[PDB]
Amino acid sequence: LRELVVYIVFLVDICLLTYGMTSSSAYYYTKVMSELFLHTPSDSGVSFQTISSMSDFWDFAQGPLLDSLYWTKWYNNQSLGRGSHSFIYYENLLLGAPRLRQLRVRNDSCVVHEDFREDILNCYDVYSPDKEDQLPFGPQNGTAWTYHSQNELGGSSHWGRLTSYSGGGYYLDLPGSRQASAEALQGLQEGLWLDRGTRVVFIDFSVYNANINLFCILRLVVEFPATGGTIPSWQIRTVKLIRYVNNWDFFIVGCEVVFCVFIFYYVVEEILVWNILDLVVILLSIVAVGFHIFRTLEVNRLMGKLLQQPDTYADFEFLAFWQTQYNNMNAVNLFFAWIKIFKYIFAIMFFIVFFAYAQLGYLLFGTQVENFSTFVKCIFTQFRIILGDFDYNAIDNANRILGPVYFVTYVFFVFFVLLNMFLAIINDT
Amino acid sequence: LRELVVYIVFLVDICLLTYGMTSSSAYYYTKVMSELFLHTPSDSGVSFQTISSMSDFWDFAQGPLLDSLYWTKWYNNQSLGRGSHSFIYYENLLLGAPRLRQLRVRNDSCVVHEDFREDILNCYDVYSPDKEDQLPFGPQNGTAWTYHSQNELGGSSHWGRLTSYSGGGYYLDLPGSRQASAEALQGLQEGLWLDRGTRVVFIDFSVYNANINLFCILRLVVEFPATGGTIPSWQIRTVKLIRYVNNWDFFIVGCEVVFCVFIFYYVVEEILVWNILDLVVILLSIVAVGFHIFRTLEVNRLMGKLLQQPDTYADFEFLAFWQTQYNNMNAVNLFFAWIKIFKYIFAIMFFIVFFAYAQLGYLLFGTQVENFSTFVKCIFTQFRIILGDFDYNAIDNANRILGPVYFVTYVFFVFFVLLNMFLAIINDT
Amino acid sequence: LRELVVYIVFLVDICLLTYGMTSSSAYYYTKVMSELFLHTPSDSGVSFQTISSMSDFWDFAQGPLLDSLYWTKWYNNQSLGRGSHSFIYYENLLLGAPRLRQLRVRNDSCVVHEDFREDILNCYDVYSPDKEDQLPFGPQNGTAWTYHSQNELGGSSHWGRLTSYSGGGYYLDLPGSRQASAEALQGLQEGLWLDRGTRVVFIDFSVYNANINLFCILRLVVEFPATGGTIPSWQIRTVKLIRYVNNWDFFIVGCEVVFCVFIFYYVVEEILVWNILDLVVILLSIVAVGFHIFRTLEVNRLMGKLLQQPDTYADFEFLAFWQTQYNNMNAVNLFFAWIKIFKYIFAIMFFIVFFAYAQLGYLLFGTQVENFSTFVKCIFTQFRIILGDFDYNAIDNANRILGPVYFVTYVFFVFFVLLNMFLAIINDT
Amino acid sequence: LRELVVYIVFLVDICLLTYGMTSSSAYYYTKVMSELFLHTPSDSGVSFQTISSMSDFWDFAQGPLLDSLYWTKWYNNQSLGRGSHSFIYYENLLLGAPRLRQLRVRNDSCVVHEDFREDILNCYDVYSPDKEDQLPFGPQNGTAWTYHSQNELGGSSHWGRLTSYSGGGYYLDLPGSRQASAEALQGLQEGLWLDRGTRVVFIDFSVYNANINLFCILRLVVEFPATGGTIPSWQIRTVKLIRYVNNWDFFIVGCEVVFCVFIFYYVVEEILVWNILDLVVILLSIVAVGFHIFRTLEVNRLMGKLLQQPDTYADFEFLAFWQTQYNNMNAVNLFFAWIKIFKYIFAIMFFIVFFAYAQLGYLLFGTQVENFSTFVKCIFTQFRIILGDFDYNAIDNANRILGPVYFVTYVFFVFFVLLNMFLAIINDT
Ligand SMILES: *[C@@H]1O[C@H](CO)[C@@H](O)[C@H](O)[C@H]1NC(C)=O
Ligand SMILES: *[C@@H]1O[C@H](CO)[C@@H](O)[C@H](O)[C@H]1NC(C)=O
Ligand SMILES: *[C@@H]1O[C@H](CO)[C@@H](O)[C@H](O)[C@H]1NC(C)=O
Ligand SMILES: *[C@@H]1O[C@H](CO)[C@@H](O)[C@H](O)[C@H]1NC(C)=O
Ligand SMILES: *[C@@H]1O[C@H](CO)[C@@H](O)[C@H](O)[C@H]1NC(C)=O
Ligand SMILES: *[C@@H]1O[C@H](CO)[C@@H](O)[C@H](O)[C@H]1NC(C)=O
Ligand SMILES: *[C@@H]1O[C@H](CO)[C@@H](O)[C@H](O)[C@H]1NC(C)=O
Ligand SMILES: *[C@@H]1O[C@H](CO)[C@@H](O)[C@H](O)[C@H]1NC(C)=O
Ligand SMILES: *[C@@H]1O[C@H](CO)[C@@H](O)[C@H](O)[C@H]1NC(C)=O
Ligand SMILES: *[C@@H]1O[C@H](CO)[C@@H](O)[C@H](O)[C@H]1NC(C)=O
Ligand SMILES: *[C@@H]1O[C@H](CO)[C@@H](O)[C@H](O)[C@H]1NC(C)=O
Ligand SMILES: *[C@@H]1O[C@H](CO)[C@@H](O)[C@H](O)[C@H]1NC(C)=O
């Protein structure tokens, strides 16, 4: 019964270590930033979410995005007394400069069919890293008009709605004030910096809050499919990077070294079914150990760069990405750490036909309704239908005969099979 | 156990043949075109979905529809360098010309009642093909003002929300550029090309995407009932017609001939309960065989016509219609082909009263709520109520006494009968 | 087994008689008229549903309502060739003239409390027919400014959202054209025809469709509570009044006399448990017999009046009211007539506590959330909660402590009691 | 069986006493006032709910709020004949003057991190009563620019969305007419009366309805977090304070003394399991006794003040607060009083894992989705998921891998554990 007590001590160790990272003021910080950039219309009624075509994109970029970044003067039109830096909502510092970057696809990327070769001289295929266009275009001069590899821009794969994307492309870094920035983007509308070759466009920038201590790092990802049009999407992550606050941070250093003491104790007692869960928990634990040194190194380097050369994009997106997935790992560890307490204290006919419906629904619908438009989405759509959440209008207007047949037939299937499962389990009794 | 293996080979045959037709880039192609034509307002705030009366229709036709068809210049107001053809979203070619066509009903189509014969000199009845008005009207000159049979316009029945419609009517084919087109439709507003006689108005046009290979064929169907007003509706189908891409298309020809080899094998082994499913699967299989020759002939002919005489409507709607229903057939075949693996490895009291509620609900509601407005819609509405999806406000504001009596009473009926079914099945145990 | 056959003959008799009244084109007729009057905004963005205060009402009455009534010219601004009458959507005749009528409450209707007698010289209480103000006001001249009893205006009780209302009040009948009408309502804004005394305002008018045969009779009821503000509400009923169409109407006369033959047969065989249902069905049958003579008399009289003196309100609202409730009666008869085929072929602990929750929820909520704002609404709200339809945000923002306690506690109550019912019924087995 | 009868007499006593307080016209009174202040946009499209930043707040305060308070002239632009007082909707008197009051936080409230000390000279921390800034600011002159304790302003804690707030702060009391008021708030925009130090801003005012007898007391609470931006929120309570109406009020005095007679009878019979419920009911009863004297004293004093010095804020918010919570207490008493009739006539595996999901969901989501943003909200969110109310899009866009794993895994957990509970209970049978 002593190993139990020690185990509890482990639960409060991991508990304080993971709840040390969070903040109850995070949610409103995301909510405020997102509702600042996403929802604010331009004069043309162009929000970010509602971007349709390219001209809408330019109406957005030269629109709110240049007035929701650079704040200078108060609401009473009196100047704000902090020099030359842009404070979003007066309370939020803007780190470095924002960066656009684009991805292009090669001029002739496929074979136009034989009938149309008269009217169509070019094929720009869907994005795949094999076909990415590395040559310059436009006036072919600055870093906006000429390619850059994934090394020259330190970066990882962004994984969007269509397909994953590399880290290269034609970046531009907006200058400090507003006016110079508008001169830039106006310069990119002059020439065509968005043409048929374009595929993905990223806008990255990050913000640091002085009052509490948090970063809001955000990516605005607009995709241009081969079909034309646009698909806007966004990721906004708020993150506690610097863990130094007060002597409490030194209590967090002590907490960390206590934690590694614990894990060494648990590898000692480990080596000599539930022990599966043990080796997992310890595995993700020691994965979580080194990340703090990784982080302190990273932050030290970045704040080094921002210190040296302002008006230069400094990547917080990689660091924020791995910080948040680090938090996900801690969450799963902690959850298992609660499950572990218990250690210290015919269906094939259903699955086959189930996937058969997933497939059928994907074929009949899926060029109409989004919820069916891929296979996994079909699986979870059918699962919600079991749980009693569905939109029948969509299924019914996609195909107004086979729709009701699908819906009804599926309902009777699940209902009926579930029944036979009940009667079988009662037969076991 | 060998016939099993051969059967699996059949499953991968049909599998690759049906998944050969689809594309994962289809959904966004429909989504983009539909959100281009349907949702874009005019200056008057007139979307397509929101069309109310005739003047709204004309505000739409001379509105966005002429600016969401003809694209000429880039977003920077630089000319686009492809000659005279209209590329929607710059990536999508426009095939031929768009076509309006109308259906009229005869001047005196019924008997005005005896009381009103003083104030009402005309009856235009509901549309039925018996009463379709074949005489010219207006200035009585062009092909817009004079009837055309269903042969002179190759076409099949469109089946809309009210009733099915023929393929005849008074067509107009818009010219190439925008300006000439606006001159046309302005010419049709000058005279009354929509008058009390009108019933259905169709706008048909189709689009071919060069980057991927797909067609988006779309019909915009606005109905004018006898009651006045309008009911806008639409059908948008994206279709892979030309299956020739690369040598992979030749692997698709080999796949097809392998498939017919399979079906001949299965008629040989067939002729000498589950065999019901066998004869069905083979039936729809051989139905699916000839459609490819039918299609290659059709496409060959059409692209022949578009080749010969541009600015002439060339029907892709018939071909797209049968291509999509062909895909539905393949979907059902494939689904059965998955079910078939298993071959190789008191209620009357409920139904009577159920339909009795369907009828009651249709009579009490149904001049108010849409979900009840016909009989089949009542059946599926009550079925959703069983599944726990309903809008109680509607039922309650239609009739605020009998509404709750209907809803409650029905709930207790289904609940209670289901109970007695449980207790009965437990009695069988 | 012969009485069975005769009974079936009864089912097809009542079946054809009740389905003779309906029309499948009704729903779109209501939908079109309602979306014409209710939803069309004015220049100020004032729809009918969105009416807030009195100035909004006047912005509506002189707004769309005078342009959604009088139609004169086509969409091409060419005159329409039917003399002086107003055709709504060109297909719908307007019967007679529209009528406003108001209800007033007496000057000093209650006792102002003792503290405020200095600042408040008048009390206008809630509407009850005892306090209705019968004296003239304003310029005190026309029929708009002077009272009229419920006899001088033939009319019945309208039953709205707050309380039932009589048929008297200060009516005004709008003239024929638009311009004279605007002169009228402008004349009623000049003086105050809506002042603190006002309680209910009705706008009644009816429309006859020539193409099909139906009436759309509609009431727009705006209520001004004692609290101030407004509560707009509406009733739109489409009705087949004249049943004369063709010789088929004579087949309907034969059908009626066959029906009365049947009911006499059933009183003969009746007089000499399920017979309860028999006497009910026959009762509502013979109630339904005389209504046709009542109706033919009524319609004959009305069309007499419209024939004699146009530009005079002629009530179709009484007749439409009883026609629709007649249709409800036929619906219930027919439903029982289907049930009748079978003739020819611990809870107190739950109900007490249930009503106890209805009461509690009414007291805690109900000055906030509408669904709880009266007692019956609380009953059906809790019933939906059992059926899994609820809005938790409302309950939670009304009182953010007792709300979740109510919701959770109720859920466990119903869940748990239902359980004990299951185990009890299994004990009976 | 006599104590039963006497008990019923108790039920009708408490019944008439609690139903004496309510009114069926309350709901529309809240609904009307709330839809007057909350939803009415300004010229800039700024509603109250939609307030985003500070400049939006000022656009609201000088916007509708000064035109939804002071009513002078009728809708026909004729003057209203009640002197100098402002009648909202002409039927509602405005009691006293409205009051703004603010809360500030100290200049340097925390330690800026070491890296940023160059660009950031100030930390304004989250609100806690320890850090509240008591010094004057701005021109440092009036009662708007200088602190006031919680005694000098009689007031209690407001408990908002973020944290509880004290009653002190920098109040301003708007003058009588509109013009002087606009001069005031313009004077507060001139200087910065909202600066980085601000945290909460309250607008309090109350309204008395003469026709019925009720008060609508309302607080408009706008919060400025440390993160920037705003969180608007509101409380609107309608209350019957003065219970004097007619001789019926004297029947209410008799009712009260009868009630205390009852409770003395029940302490006599009390002193000599269900008796737990007895001592509770009697406890809250005698708590409810003294509140009437407390109230009559309070109202007497207030109406004394409003009598003496108009244009001075007189607090009805404290009194309304305790009146409504008094009504909540009566509601619970009455509910128990209905329950009481009956007196006179393995799970740990589920709860542990349940809270484990609450925690996991709070960590993974909760910086994205609101429903998860705190721990209790996670508990009730998961409880609704059990009851079949959820938004899957949110969970899925927060984290698009771990989201479905959370949702599915939780569903199988609850489903499966519930099953084993069924089979266990059947084993007990
Ligand atoms: C707003 O600021 C501009 C900055 O140049 C100034 O010219 C203008 O007078 C200001 N308007 C005000 C204070 O109303
Ligand atoms: C295709 O694009 C390239 C850009 O890399 C350009 O140099 C070339 O001229 C284009 N081809 C044609 C036929 O214009
Ligand atoms: C841009 O083009 C001009 C024109 O020759 C050239 O002088 C300049 O160096 C170019 N910019 C860069 C960064 O090379
Ligand atoms: C837009 O194009 C028109 C075409 O004639 C031209 O006259 C005008 O100057 C252009 N406006 C620009 C480039 O801003
Ligand atoms: C009815 O319509 C026809 C069109 O086919 C027209 O020729 C005829 O004159 C119309 N009847 C009357 C009475 O105007
Ligand atoms: C249109 O009417 C004119 C007037 O006579 C005629 O010359 C012309 O041929 C008509 N158009 C056609 C296509 O017949
Ligand atoms: C619309 O009708 C009016 C009626 O007087 C007329 O003056 C005007 O010219 C017409 N406008 C057109 C036909 O565009
Ligand atoms: C009350 O209203 C009546 C209208 O019937 C009016 O004659 C009377 O003068 C009013 N009372 C007062 C005190 O103005
Ligand atoms: C309206 O008032 C005038 C003024 O005396 C009067 O002549 C006229 O008769 C009145 N109208 C009616 C319908 O009595
Ligand atoms: C509205 O009231 C103002 C108040 O001065 C007055 O000048 C104006 O003429 C009035 N407008 C009307 C009655 O239309
Ligand atoms: C901080 O705010 C106070 C207001 O209480 C002010 O007196 C002081 O000057 C501020 N500090 C600095 C460094 O400006
Ligand atoms: C406001 O400031 C002026 C300037 O000295 C002063 O005279 C006045 O008394 C101040 N107001 C109050 C209420 O003290």
Numbering used by the authors:
A (entry chain D), B (entry chain B), C (entry chain C), D (entry chain A): 101 to 372, 385 to 457, 480 to 563
From the paper:
PKD2L1 is encoded by the gene PKD2L1 (10q25) and was the third member among the PKD proteins to be identified. Moreover, experiments have shown that PKD2L1 can generate a large tail current in the depolarization–repolarization process, which further indicates the propensity of PKD2L1 to form a nonselective voltage-dependent cation channel. PKD2L1 is thought to be involved in the formation of functional channel complexes with PKD1L3 or PKD1L1, two homologs of PKD1. Of all the members of the PKD family, we found that PKD2L1 is one of mostly widely studied channels that can form a functional homotetrameric channel when heterologously expressed on the plasma membrane.
To understand the structural basis underlying the gating mechanism of PKD2L1, we determine the cryo-EM structure of mouse PKD2L1 with C4 symmetry at an overall resolution of 3.38 Å. In order to enhance biochemical stability, we truncated large portions of the N- and C-termini of PKD2L1 to form the PKD2L1 (residues 64–629) construct. The PKD2L1 (residues 64–629) structure is composed of four protomers with unrecognizable EM densities around cytoplasmic domains and allows the visualization of residues 101–563. The polycystin domains lock onto each other on the extracellular side, stabilizing the homotetrameric ion channels. One of the key differences between the structures of PKD2L1 and PKD2 is that the S4–S5 linker in PKD2L1 is invisible at near-atomic resolutions, which reflects the flexibility of the linker. Structural comparison of the pore domains of PKD2L1 and PKD2 reveals that PKD2L1 has an open-pore structure. L641 serves as the constriction site (5.0 Å) that prevents Ca2+ and Na+ passing through the upper gate at the closed state of PKD2; whereas G522 is the narrowest site (7.3 Å) of the PKD2L1 structure, representing the more permissive state allowing ions to conduct. L677 serves as the constriction site (4.9 Å) at the closed state of PKD2; whereas I560 is the narrowest site (8.3 Å) of the open state, still allowing hydrated ions to pass through the gate. Structural alignment of S6 reveals a π-helix in the middle of S6 in PKD2, whereas S6 adopts a canonical α-helix in PKD2L1. In the structure of PDK2L1, oligosaccharides are identified on N241 and N207.
